[PDB]
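Fold this complex.
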Amino acid sequence: FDIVQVYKKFLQDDPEITMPVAAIEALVQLLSRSQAKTISEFMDILQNGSNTLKEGVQNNISLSAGCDIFQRFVTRSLHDVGDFEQCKRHLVENGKLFIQRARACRQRIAHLGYPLIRDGSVILTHGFSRGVAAVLLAAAKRHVRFKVFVTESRPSGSGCLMTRTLKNACIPTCMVLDSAVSFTMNRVDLVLVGAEGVVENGGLINQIGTFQLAVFAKHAHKPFYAVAESHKFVRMFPLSQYDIPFSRPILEFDDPSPETPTPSDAIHNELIMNEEQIRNNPTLDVTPPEFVSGLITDLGIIDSKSGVSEELIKLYL
Amino acid sequence: IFEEKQVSIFSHLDWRRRRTTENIPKDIHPAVIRLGLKLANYKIFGSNQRCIDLLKTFKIVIQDYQTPYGTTLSRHLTTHINSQIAYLVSTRPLSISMGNAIRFLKLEISVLDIDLTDDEGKELLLEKIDSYIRDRIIIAGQVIVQAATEKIQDGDVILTYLHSSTVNDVLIHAKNVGKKFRVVVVDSRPEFEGRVCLKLLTEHGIECTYVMISALSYIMQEVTKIFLGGHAMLSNGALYSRAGTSLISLLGHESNVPVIACCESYKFTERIQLDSLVYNELAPGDQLVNMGVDDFEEKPGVLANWKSVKNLKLLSLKYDVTPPRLITVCVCEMGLLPSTSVPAIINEF
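Structure:
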């Protein structure tokens, strides 16, 4: 059934979908084509299916979150004198009626987020995030006068896409290098980032340059807001900002044996790292909750971030 | 002798003042008497201005000093001045500036050549006092003003606290040379010295904003630079100035505002205080009694009888110690230096 192929399938299907939701839709259309009819048969199922899904995509955190939400909805109404089939249709029936809220969650976020931008302020964002864009755009329509710094986000290069996205809405933009983010913090009134996933302690898993912005923000005494939908909450507890499942081997060294001038103003765009080297660098980092001012979700703005824990507590019994 | 230090943290601070010339010793020079009255009865009297008037007074004291038959000029002039000091101390505790100038004068008296006649000895001492005021106070002050006004960029919003002659002269000179800026004058109780500043600045046409120290958080979001006039720089780099200066520096730090301390090198001391209670100066608690935004205009206060009231004590400290990590730069006549360079500058004399 090649669940993986499907999961990737939505992802291209619809730019506005989230990796967790794409995993939920995956399991649904497996639950459609799933002959099943044994709880043993019925529940043996996805687990090999999300497992197969988890092992089929290399960075798996976000889809694992959407997964984790799915089965807990499954067993919690399979508990309850649970019959199988009524959930099997009801999930396949309302699958369209899932990527409904997921889209409504983002809009709910933007309606909560945009007042954080007030007249004459300068925003800083790292890379491209649909949620961040949603918040910024929603503020723009209300004729709010603001400007946005966008970090050239290597390796993804998401900075260009976000810059153009904001340029289309007549929002004044300016791109900054990953090395110049600290120098710009004095001109920044607010920092706004998205997140692929939010861990148990309310920490952020996102693009590799995220935590550096949160660090500069803390140092420059500027508010740092994260933008993520509720279904990005995942039960996993990184013990450091380095503790995550690695897709590829990372940060390993050369082994040379006897193997046989630049000014600072000089601009050498041809002097960047190659992709062989870049595949040795991480794709994601972790941002501790003590760097996050408030976490904007569809559930509202979570400042406690013992509250993200509260939600994951409710999810599991 | 006062030795009894009890539970109160403020118990060690000397509270005894002398506001009148009643039962005054007969060996006190008329010029010292007038200075002593001005010391304990004035209200805005800069640490620099205190030192200048002290040295000019000692000039008159020395000039009129006639050495007795019981001693040479060197040994007894220090005794005669010691009497003038003890009286001055009784009126109001010596400033660091005054204390430093006194150590200077006492030194030059001891290094006086004995072969000099008394009139040559007095003439020389007056020369060195003249040179001290000229170089260490006036010229040094001029250098500080120019060096500090240099850092004022067009569009700046300069915060100042109370009434600092140094900061005032910097701001005024900035206005004169053509700098385009505005000023936030932060004032405080029990005495609104910031209004004296606000009057001076507005008279020179400088655009100003006037707030109390409680509004610091609110007004700090407009400030680009902070300028502070110091009473003394400690040898650990800490700034010893009036009142809430530490609060200005602390909140200034949280808003990424550069804290600039302007202090003449002659007011550098070798003392190092860890807290703000060990070395300070008490102000009369009666100042805190009448509250309605004025110093002497009268209408009965709720705390008028606080001395009679058990367990109710009032007090206002004149100074506090701002930690060195909250000061960005110290501006002296030697140029802009890190405040930890204070003990280094001291050895250079």
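The radius of gyration of chain B is 22 Å.
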